[PDB]
Design a protein around this ligand. Structure first.
Ligand SMILES: [Hg+2]
Ligand SMILES: [Zn+2]
Length: 258
């Protein structure tokens, strides 16, 4: 009986095995746009993905991860509220059973159809494992997804989902360019937070883009065909794999614009 998104093992149950669930800097959070403050101290954000080397896509039972080669400085995130260089290790999404929900962060309580998380670790810590033992070990770039026109750069991901339908399945996924998932603007909100799935470690500097990307109904509908279960087990559609907004507590959300 492990954690999940159901009635008996969902987000409201996580604190029992992971006490930090009720911590001081948990994510996601609602982004109250009128409370956020423009921060002049924020340096320009740098997203360098031209050398990104994707390797595989995996259904881990919670979502599907597109993994990258992080043995060298290729795809990195720098600038903004960040000090140093953060290396891309994987990206995944969170989505709902309907277009009206799915995102983890919300904007003035608005829920988007999905949310993309590009996960990076601080290179000064040597590895992802050591990085998650530091308060500034990770940087996650969050991007909202709304339903409308199709996102060409997402189609290659959508088309391979049929090959990793169940938990534990993986497939080669080389030469995928994450630059095709980014909106035009890099305006963002930033705050200190945590991982949104167990172990819910508080080592994340969150950078959430204001501009969402548009994906087609057809594209997100295929996300909903994935399974939480493993092959040969009763089918449980992988939907609503998102954690709700958590208490902001002693934190302030800063804006890079205005
Ligand atoms: Hg940490
Ligand atoms: Zn996530």
């Amino acid at each position: 009986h492990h954690w999940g998104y159901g009635k008996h093992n969902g987000p409201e149950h996580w604190h029992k095995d992971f006490p930090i669930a009720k911590g001081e800097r948990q994510s996601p959070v609602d982004i109250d746009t009128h409370t956020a403050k423009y921060d002049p101290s924020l340096k320009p954000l740098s997203v360098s993905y031209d050398q990104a080397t994707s390797l595989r896509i995996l259904n881990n039972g919670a979502a599907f991860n597109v993994e990258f080669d992080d043995s060298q400085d290729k795809a990195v995130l720098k600038g903004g509220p960040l000090d140093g260089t953060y290396r891309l290790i994987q990206f995944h999404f969170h989505w709902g059973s309907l277009d009206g929900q799915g995102s983890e962060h919300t904007v003035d309580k608005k829920k988007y159809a999905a949310e993309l998380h590009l996960v990076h670790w601080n290179t000064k810590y040597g590895d992802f494992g050591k990085a998650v033992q530091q308060p500034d070990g990770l940087a996650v770039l969050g991007i909202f997804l709304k339903v409308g026109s199709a996102k060409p750069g997402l189609q290659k991901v959508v088309d391979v989902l049929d090959s990793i339908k169940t938990k534990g399945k993986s497939a080669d996924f080389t030469n995928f360019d994450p630059r095709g998932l980014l909106p035009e603007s890099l305006d963002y909100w930033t705050y200190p937070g945590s991982l949104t799935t167990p172990p819910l470690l508080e080592c994340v500097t969150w950078i959430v883009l204001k501009e969402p990307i548009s994906v087609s109904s057809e594209q997100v509908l295929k996300f909903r065909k994935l399974n939480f279960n493993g092959e040969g087990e009763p089918e449980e559609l992988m939907v609503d794999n998102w954690r709700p907004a958590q208490p902001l507590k002693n934190r302030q959300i800063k804006a890079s614009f205005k």
